[PDB]
Amino acid sequence: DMTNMDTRTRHLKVSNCPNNSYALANVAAVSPNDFPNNIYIIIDNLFVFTTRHSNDIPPGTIGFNGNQRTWGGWSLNQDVQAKAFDLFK
Amino acid sequence: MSDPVELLKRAEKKGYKFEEAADLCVQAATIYLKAADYQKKAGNEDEAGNTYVEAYKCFKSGGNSVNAVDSLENAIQIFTHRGQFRRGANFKFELGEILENDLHDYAKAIDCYELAGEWYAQDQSVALSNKCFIKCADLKALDGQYIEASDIYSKLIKSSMGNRLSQWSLKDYFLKKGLCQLAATDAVAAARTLQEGQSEDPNFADSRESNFLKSLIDAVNEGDSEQLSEHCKEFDNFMRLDKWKITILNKIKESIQQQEDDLL
Amino acid sequence: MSDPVELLKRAEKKGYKFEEAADLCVQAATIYRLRKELNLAGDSFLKAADYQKKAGNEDEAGNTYVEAYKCFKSGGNSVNAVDSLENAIQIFTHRRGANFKFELGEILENDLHDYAKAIDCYELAGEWYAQDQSVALSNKCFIKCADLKALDGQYIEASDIYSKLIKSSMGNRLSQWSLKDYFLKKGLCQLAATDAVAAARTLQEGQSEDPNFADSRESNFLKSLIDAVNEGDSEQLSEHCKEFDNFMRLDKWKITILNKIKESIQQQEDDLL
């Protein structure tokens, strides 16, 4: 249910993926304090990913795998903008 | 010939008295630091520094690197305290050599080389300072300090610019600097260095070193480690690589591997 | 360590008395040098040198002035370095002057951009070196002087200095190439002065006197430039310049000379109307 969610923009650091399993799932791992669980989030208004709760990633940081960085051309520790996404609208 | 042990005992007993004890110690030692200490106690600092240089000389010859280092330190302090920074810089460079080769204390060698180069610069001796800075940058890059090594290479480039004599050095300098910037994963800085070298020094623009640096920059940009290895072999085939470059490019390749680990 | 300010105050109070004041100033100044306060150390050497002059020890004053020049130059104060070199040069000449005059000319040319004074210094240094029979040092000073003079609009004088260099370097196996360039440069200067006939005379003299220059690329380039100026074909001159650059890179001096020459062809085109 995506009807209600905080859409405020956040600046998050790109860091190494927590482990091989998270990279396989292709889901943006975020802390519970960052965003709700199982919702679609857009990044840079171009890159959309599904959020999953992860206690290993501190609040204010976003985890990515290599393929996502290759797609976005990002380096380690780069700052990216994250917002809530609504594809249906 | 007098017994050196008896002379040393007499010097200790007398230790003008300090001068006589120092002379006795010098005689016993010649038959074979204490004399320099006595000279310091006598106020003759210059003679103490010369005697310390002699102590360093024989300690290095006897394989006693530690005592040689100590003697150089006292001599350097004495000379610097007397305004003879030229002597201090020469002996600091020798001390850095001793640290780098005999004791493998690379950090102290880096400090010694940096200080010797700075004092040489203060004496307007461009070439000795340039040599000291080459040594300092080489050790710093080998020590994991790529950014500082690149900065020292920039200083070397600026000091050697416009001199017809140091051309070749420049040709290498640019390359080395870029390599260091590429060891720090800063490919953009390496490209900037290559462009600056190409535009500022016509010799470097057409030099094989410039092409090799451009090829390395392109390889890191595409993340093709094998292409980097091929370029390294091609470069080796015409101009032999040295252990410094081997280490820099090995860390660069391991950084590509780390990026591949980061890729997963 | 003693306070350099207190030492300077004591030196001023005492200023045999001059010798003691100079020693105190030297001590304070070495302390300043130890602190990397190069400008204050230079000022203190200058005070010590002045006191030594007042004491009659002119040689010590000159050495102290040289130290002032060294530390001012290391400290980035070009003007005080120039002043110190001037006093040292005067002291030495009255009793080294050429060496320090060459250094002074270098300082003027690179740091202060006072090209006329640099030309004067180089000319004087070369003359004194010639008086000492040091052919190579005089030749270097004259190269610098001629280069600056040609860049300064004095083409005839630069060509004369190049002729002097040619005469001094003739017969020496070590300076052959220098001659090969000398002739060229001289001709270029004569061509900057619109004196194409003199350039041709210089080329002929170089070809007949120095076999190496006769077959050298520089001789062909000079002949091509002379022909181009004779026909008034500026584009042909540009083509020759590019051809010359392709095998032997040109330097900024030649760039300026040939640019003024091309602008002189344009001025002739203005006179054509």
The DSSP line for A51-63 is: EEE-TTS-TTEEE
CA–CA gap between residue A28 and residue C152 (Å, rounded): 70
C-alpha closest to that of C31 among C15, C13, C18, C43 = C43
CB B150 within 8 A of CB B177: yes
C74, B202: Cβ pair inside 8 Å? no
Q: Which one-letter amino acid corresponds to residue C159?
A: S
* Experimental determination technique: cryo-EM
C34, B202: Cβ pair inside 8 Å? no
Query: Hey, how many other C-beta atoms are within 10 angstroms of the C-beta on B155?
Result: 18
B124, C74: Cβ pair inside 8 Å? yes
Contacts of C34 in chain B (CB under 8 A): 80, 83
Strand ranges, E, within chain A: 10-15, 28-30, 40-43, 47-53, 61-63, 79-84
CA distances (Å), origin B247, targets B141, B142, C147: 9, 7, 46
CA distances (Å), origin C242, targets B205, B225, C246, C249, C258: 18, 41, 6, 9, 12
CB B16 within 8 A of CB B35: no
Helices (H), C132-250: 135-151, 155-169, 176-192, 196-209, 211-214, 217-231, 234-247
Express the helix, strand and coil content of chain A in percent, nearest 5 each. Answer: 15, 35, 55
Q: Sheet holding A61-63: strands in order across?
A: A28-30, A47-53, A40-43, A79-84, A10-15, A61-63
C-alpha closest to that of C91 among C55, C60, C124 = C60
A20, B264: Cβ pair inside 8 Å? yes
- Pick the residue from chain B with its C-alpha nearest to A71: B263
- State the chains in contact with B (3 or more Cβ–Cβ pairs under 8 Å): A, C
C34, B80: Cβ pair inside 8 Å? yes
C-alpha closest to that of C175 among C150, C128, C212 = C212
- Contacts of B42-50 with C-beta under 8 Å, sequence gap 24+, read B42/B16, B42/B18, B44/B19, B45/B78, B45/B81, B45/B82, B46/B78, B46/B82, B47/B22, B48/B74, B48/B78, B49/B74, B49/B75, B49/B78, B49/B79, B49/B82, B49/B87
Q: Round to the nearest angstrom and report the end-to-end CA distance of chain A.
A: 14
Contacts of B124 in chain C (CB under 8 A): 70, 73-74
Contacts of C253 in chain B (CB under 8 A): none
Q: In degrees, to the nearest 5, what angle opens at C-alpha B146 toward C-alphas B163 and A17? A: 150
Query: Hey, how many other C-beta atoms are within 10 angstroms of the C-beta on C36?
Result: 11
C-alpha closest to that of B173 among B216, B146, B137 = B137
Residue B9: half-sphere exposure toward Cβ, Cα within 13 Å: 5
Rg of the Cα trace of chain C?
Answer: 25
Q: Which one-letter amino acid corresponds to residue B234?
A: E
CA–CA gap between residue B233 and residue B221 (Å, rounded): 19
Helices (H), chain B: 4-14, 17-31, 34-42, 45-61, 65-81, 85-98, 106-122, 126-142, 146-160, 167-183, 187-200, 202-205, 208-222, 225-238, 243-262
Contacts of B264 in chain A (CB under 8 A): 17, 20, 23, 65-66
C36, B202: Cβ pair inside 8 Å? no
Cβ contacts of residue C258 below 8 Å, gap of 6+? Answer: C188, C225, C237, C241, C250
Tell me if residue A47 falls in helix, strand or coil.
Answer: strand
Structure tokens at C273: 């109307």
- Please give, rounded to a whole number of angstroms, the shortest distance from the CA of B203 to a CA of chain A: 34
Chains A and B in direct contact, meaning 3 or more beta-carbon pairs closer than 8 angstroms: yes
Directed axis angle between helix C176-192 and helix C155-169, to 10°?
A: 160
CB B21 within 8 A of CB B14: yes
Contacts of B80 in chain C (CB under 8 A): 34
CA–CA gap between residue B136 and residue B120 (Å, rounded): 14
Q: Which of B80, B85, B124 sits opposite C73 (nearest CB)?
A: B124
CA–CA gap between residue B187 and residue A12 (Å, rounded): 24
C36, B122: Cβ pair inside 8 Å? yes
Cβ contacts of residue C17 below 8 Å, gap of 6+? Answer: none
CA–CA gap between residue C135 and residue B116 (Å, rounded): 36
Structure tokens at C142: 């004259």
Contacts of B263 in chain A (CB under 8 A): 65-67, 69-70
C-alpha closest to that of B227 among B211, B238, B210, B215 = B215
- Which value in Å is the resolution of this experimental model? 3.8
- State the chains in contact with C (3 or more Cβ–Cβ pairs under 8 Å): B
